[PDB]
C-alpha cells in the first residue's frame, strides 16, 4: 500500500558501471536460453512422452518451476540496468522476489525427491515398484509447491518498495533495522542447502556403493555412471556454494560483526555474480537430467 522512507547505512555499495551492463546482459542470455530450453523440455516430457514414470513427473514440475522464475527475470534485468531503480511498483516487487525464492526452494526440494526415487528404483526396484505410483508423485509435487511457497512467505511479507532519502532512489528490497532478518538467510542456508544437499549426497552415495559392490563380484557397463554421479552432486554443490557463502557473509553485515562499507561493497558487487551462476546452472537442470535418458535425448534432438 504505502511507500516507506529509508536511510541507507552503506548506500554506494555494488554501484559500479560494469555491473550495470554485465548483469542485465547475462540475465538476457539466461532468459532466452531458459525459456526455449525448458519449454521444449515440457513439450517432450508431457505431450511427446505422456508422463509414464515418477521421474517424468518430477522432471515436468522442475521445468514448470523454472519457467515461472524466467518470466520474472526481465524485471530484475531492467531493474539492474537502471542503476537499481524499481519502476514496477510494490505488487510486482512482491511477486518477483517471491518467485526467485520460490524457484530456489522448489528446485532443490524436487532434486531431493528425485534422489530418493532413483535410490529406491535401483536398490529396491521390486518392493518400491508398488509404493511408487503416479498419485504419490503428484501428491508429493503439490506438497513441494505448497512448502516452497511456505518458505518464500517472508519474501512476500517483507519485500517493499522504499524511497532512499539520502540518494533519491526508489528501490525494491528488504530493509534491515537487529530486527531478526537473519531467519531469511539461515532458511536459505540450512533449510535451502544443508538439509537437501545432505539428503541428495546420501541417496547418490547409497547408489554408488550398491553398484560398486555389484561390480566387485564380477571383477573378483556401469563404469561410466560413477563420473556421471560425481557430476550430479558436485554440479549441484558448486553452483550454489558461491551464493550461499556470500549469503552467509551478508548475515554478518545484517546485524552483527561486519560494520564496514568496503566489505559491503565487495559483497554487493559479488552477490549478482553468484546469483547469475546459481540460476544459469539451475535453469539447465531439467535439460541436464533429461539428456541422461536415451529416449528423451532422441526426442529432444529430433525436435531441433
Amino acid at each position, epitope marked *: 500500500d504505502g511507500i516507506k522512507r529509508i536511510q541507507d547505512d552503506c548506500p554506494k555499495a555494488g554501484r559500479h558501471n560494469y555491473i550495470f551492463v554485465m548483469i542485465p546482459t547475462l540475465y538476457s542470455i539466461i532468459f532466452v536460453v531458459g525459456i526455449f530450453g525448458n519449454s521444449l523440455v515440457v513439450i517432450v516430457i508431457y505431450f511427446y512422452m505422456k508422463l*509414464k514414470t515418477v*521421474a517424468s513427473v518430477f522432471l515436468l514440475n522442475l521445468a514448470l518451476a523454472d519457467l515461472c522464475f524466467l518470466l520474472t527475470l526481465p524485471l530484475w534485468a531492467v531493474y539492474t540496468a537502471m542503476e537499481y531503480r524499481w519502476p514496477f511498483g510494490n505488487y510486482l516487487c512482491k511477486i518477483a522476489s517471491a518467485s526467485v525464492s520460490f524457484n530456489l526452494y522448489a528446485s532443490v526440494f524436487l532434486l531431493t525427491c528425485l534422489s530418493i526415487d532413483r535410490y529406491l528404483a*535401483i536398490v529396491h*526396484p*521390486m518392493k518400491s515398484r508398488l509404493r511408487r505410483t503416479m498419485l504419490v508423485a503428484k501428491v508429493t509435487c503439490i506438497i513441494i509447491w505448497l512448502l516452497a511457497g511456505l518458505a518464500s512467505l517472508p519474501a512476500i511479507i517483507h519485500r517493499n518498495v522504499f524511497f532512499i532519502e539520502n540518494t533519491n532512489i526508489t528501490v525494491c528490497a528488504f530493509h534491515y533495522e537487529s530486527t531478526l532478518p537473519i531467519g531469511l538467510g539461515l532458511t536459505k542456508n540450512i533449510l535451502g542447502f544443508l538439509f537437501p544437499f545432505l539428503i541428495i549426497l546420501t541417496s547418490y552415495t547409497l547408489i554408488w556403493k550398491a553398484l560398486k559392490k555389484a561390480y566387485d563380484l564380477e571383477d573378483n*557397463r556401469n563404469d561410466d555412471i560413477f563420473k556421471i554421479i560425481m557430476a550430479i552432486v558436485l554440479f549441484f554443490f558448486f553452483s550454489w556454494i558461491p551464493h550461499q557463502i556470500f549469503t552467509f557473509l551478508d548475515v554478518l553485515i545484517q546485524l552483527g560483526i561486519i560494520r564496514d562499507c568496503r566489505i559491503a561493497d565487495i559483497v554487493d558487487t559479488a552477490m549478482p555474480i553468484t546469483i547469475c551462476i546459481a540460476y544459469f546452472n539451475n535453469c539447465l537442470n531439467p535439460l541436464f537430467y533429461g539428456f541422461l*535418458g536415451k529416449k*528423451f535425448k532422441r526426442y529432444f534432438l529430433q525436435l531441433l
Partner: nanobody
Amino acid sequence: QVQLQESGGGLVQAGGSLRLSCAASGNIFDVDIMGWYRQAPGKERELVASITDGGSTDYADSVKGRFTISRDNAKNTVYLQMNSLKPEDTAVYYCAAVAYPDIPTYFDYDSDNFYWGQGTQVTVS
C-alpha cells in the same frame, strides 16, 4: 521395447499344481531381476516372488513354502512352480523384469527400466 511372454495359467483344483513360464524377448543383453506380481480381484497388486541373476530370491510371506521361483540366464526365462494352489492364489499373475541398456545411464523417463507383461489368469477351484 522389451516383451515378456507368459504362459501356464488357467483353472486348477484346490491343492493342485501349476507352472508359470515367462520368457523375456528382444534385448541384446541380460535382464537384471525378474519376478511375478499377482493382481487379486478387487484388491491391490502384490509381489509374489522375485529372483536375481546372481541367485538371490525373495518370496512373499503368504506363499512361503508353497511356491518356488527359478530362472535361466541362458535365454532369460523365469519359472514359478506353484504347488498346493489354495483359493488365496486366485488372481491375474503378471511378469516383471528390470532390463538396462548397453552403456546404461540409470535414468529412464519412459519405462523406468521396469517392464511388465500381459498377465495370465490363474483361478483355483
